[PDB]
UniProtKB/Swiss-Prot annotation, chain A:
GO terms for molecular function: large ribosomal subunit rRNA binding; mRNA 5'-UTR binding; mRNA binding; structural constituent of ribosome; zinc ion binding. One of its GO terms (biological process) is cytoplasmic translation. CDD domains: Ribosomal_L13 (cd00392). This protein is one of the early assembly proteins of the 50S ribosomal subunit, although it is not seen to bind rRNA by itself. It is important during the early stages of 50S assembly. One of its GO terms (cellular component) is cytosolic large ribosomal subunit. It comes from Escherichia coli (strain K12). Part of the 50S ribosomal subunit. InterPro entries: Ribosomal_uL13 (IPR005822), Ribosomal_uL13_bac-type (IPR005823), Ribosomal_uL13_CS (IPR023563), Ribosomal_uL13_sf (IPR036899). Pfam families: Ribosomal_L13. This is Large ribosomal subunit protein uL13. Disulfide bonds: none annotated. PROSITE patterns: RIBOSOMAL_L13. Belongs to the universal ribosomal protein uL13 family. SUPFAM superfamilies: Ribosomal protein L13 (SSF52161). The gene is rplM.
Swiss-Prot record, chain C:
The chain holds residues 1 to 48 of 144 of the full protein. This protein binds the 5S rRNA. It is required for the late stages of subunit assembly, and is essential for 5S rRNA assembly onto the ribosome. It comes from Escherichia coli (strain K12). This is Large ribosomal subunit protein uL15. Part of the 50S ribosomal subunit. Contacts the 5S rRNA. Residues 21-31 have a biased composition (Gly residues). Residues 1-48 are annotated as: Disordered. Coiled coil: none annotated. Belongs to the universal ribosomal protein uL15 family.
From Swiss-Prot, chain D:
Belongs to the bacterial ribosomal protein bL20 family. Binds directly to 23S ribosomal RNA and is necessary for the in vitro assembly process of the 50S ribosomal subunit. It is not involved in the protein synthesizing functions of that subunit. Signal peptide: none annotated. The chain holds residues 2 to 55 of 118 of the full protein. This is Large ribosomal subunit protein bL20. Transmembrane segments: none annotated.
UniProtKB/Swiss-Prot annotation, chain E:
Keywords: Ribonucleoprotein, Ribosomal protein, RNA-binding, rRNA-binding. GO terms for molecular function: rRNA binding; structural constituent of ribosome. Part of the 50S ribosomal subunit. Contacts protein L20. It holds the Pfam family Ribosomal_L21p. This is Large ribosomal subunit protein bL21. SUPFAM superfamilies: L21p-like. It comes from Escherichia coli (strain UTI89 / UPEC). This protein binds to 23S rRNA in the presence of protein L20. The gene is rplU.
RNA sequence: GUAACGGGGCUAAACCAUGCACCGAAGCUGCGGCAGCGACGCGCGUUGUUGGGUAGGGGAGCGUUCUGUAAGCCUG
């Protein structure tokens, strides 16, 4: 006998909403990565993406503990010489809030075409209104 | 007699030659091997020198 | 008796050592001479 | 006896062909030995524990 | 109905009238065999969680044919050390049929 | 070019004390095969135990050309 593996056309998608207002960032990222990876299901398989579609609401109110709010600094190199640029958390929120949670969960996901396919499902919003009521995303209230 | 039982708990690679030779003088052959030996005080000396890798049960 | 059945008795024959014919024989590249040296040179060696 | 060794050599070279590989490996006699050296590792390095929950 | 049992070191799952490859036994080509060592049994809905070696569960089996499996090539190789060695192997197997499962 | 945690991130997911679980290798156990040495017996059993290996020593084989078996045998 062989072990059962999942197929691509025998996947059951689900949709959910998570509200990150007043929640810590990393601890939220861990569960987000778990759910998008699908290790929370009973038919998990490592070469197939079966995570839910999570909609994060209120991404401009992510709570960060301690002094990280002003010491946690981001880095990214453009490619040119001396082209290293940085941005503090205190200003990254005011510039592009959703990118905070986006980058924080990307590094927790795996890398490869499936790694990117998995990130394609996450949807992050700074506001609190969303036009996805057509898909009836049941709130994962915590 | 009493026939004490000895079980070898740790390996013998990279270990001091005297302990490697006492292991054979006792009778242990690999990890987890179980043997039964007399309670003579001569045996106690070997098992005392090698007491840091042999489990005893009495 | 005919010229097919006759066979020599055991131990009365044995194949000689053939050097440098593959690896599975054990007499590979070095051929038993060891690594470079006066001995390993062809015809090179000390006398009696 | 002068041995005319072509048949056995052609046989040996054909015996080691290893199709399905790309590029010179499958055409010429640039044949690695890793294809068979990793098999023994794999037969031990299967990862079939099936730990979905605990 | 489906059950489970241990024979030859491997815990297999068998269903009424099914074929499973097991280890090389010692029986003829059509001899009857019984497996009493059962770990659990279930006939839908009812799961009869079994203590080790449940008392009563029996699986009746009938051996069909015996043979050898696929050939495997073993190669162990050491670069730059003048070493190389090969081998071949084929595991022995005994196919069975399931003729009845009782509790 | 961040670059003195591998990374994300961690106010404990960090350090100290005690406690019960668990993952974890080609280690060890369960199940099948093969081979060397020893013991005990009558060529054959039943047991002990060993089987990573360079230089190197020992044993046993496959295969190619040619002489006899062969004016025999296979082959339009």
């Amino acid at each position: 006998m062989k072990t059962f593996t999942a197929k691509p056309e025998t996947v059951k998608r689900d949709w959910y909403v998570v509200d990150a207002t007043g929640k810590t960032l990393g601890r939220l990222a861990t569960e987000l990565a778990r759910r998008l990876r699908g290790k929370h299901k009973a038919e998990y398989t490592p070469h197939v993406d079966t995570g839910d579609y999570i909609i994060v609401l209120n991404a401009d109110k992510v709570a960060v503990t301690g002094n990280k709010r002003t010491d946690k600094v981001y880095y990214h190199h453009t490619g040119h010489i001396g082209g290293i640029k940085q941005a503090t958390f205190e200003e990254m929120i005011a510039r592009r809030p959703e990118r905070v949670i986006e980058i924080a969960v990307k590094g927790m996901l795996p890398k490869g075409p499936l790694g990117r396919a998995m990130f394609r499902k996450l949807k992050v919003y700074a506001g609190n209104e969303h036009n996805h009521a057509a898909q009836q995303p049941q709130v994962l209230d915590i | 007699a009493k026939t004490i039982k000895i079980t070898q708990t740790r390996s013998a690679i990279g270990r001091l030659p005297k302990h490697k030779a006492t292991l054979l003088g006792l009778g242990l052959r690999r990890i987890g091997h179980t043997v039964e030996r007399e309670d003579t005080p001569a045996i106690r000396g070997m098992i005392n020198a090698v007491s840091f890798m042999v489990k005893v049960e009495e | 008796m005919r010229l097919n059945t006759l066979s020599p008795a055991e131990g009365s024959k044995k194949a000689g050592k053939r050097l440098g014919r593959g690896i599975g024989s054990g007499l590979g590249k070095t051929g038993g001479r060891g690594h470079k040296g006066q001995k390993s040179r062809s015809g090179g060696g000390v006398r009696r | 006896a002068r041995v005319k060794r072509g048949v056995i050599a052609r046989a040996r070279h054909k015996k080691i062909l290893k199709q399905a590989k790309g590029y010179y490996g499958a055409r010429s006699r640039v044949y690695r030995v890793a294809f068979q050296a990793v098999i023994k590792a794999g037969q031990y390095a299967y990862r079939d524990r099936r730990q979905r929950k605990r | 109905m489906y059950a489970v049992f241990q024979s030859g070191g491997k815990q297999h799952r068998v269903s009424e009238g099914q074929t499973v490859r097991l280890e090389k036994l010692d029986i003829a080509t059509g001899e009857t065999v019984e497996f009493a060592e059962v770990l659990m049994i279930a006939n839908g809905e009812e799961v009869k969680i079994g203590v080790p070696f449940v008392d009563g569960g029996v699986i009746k089996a009938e051996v069909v044919a015996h043979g050898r499996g696929e050939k495997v090539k073993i190669v162990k190789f050491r670069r730059r050390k003048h070493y190389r060695k090969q081998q071949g192997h084929r595991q022995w197997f005994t196919d069975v049929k399931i003729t009845g499962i009782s509790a």
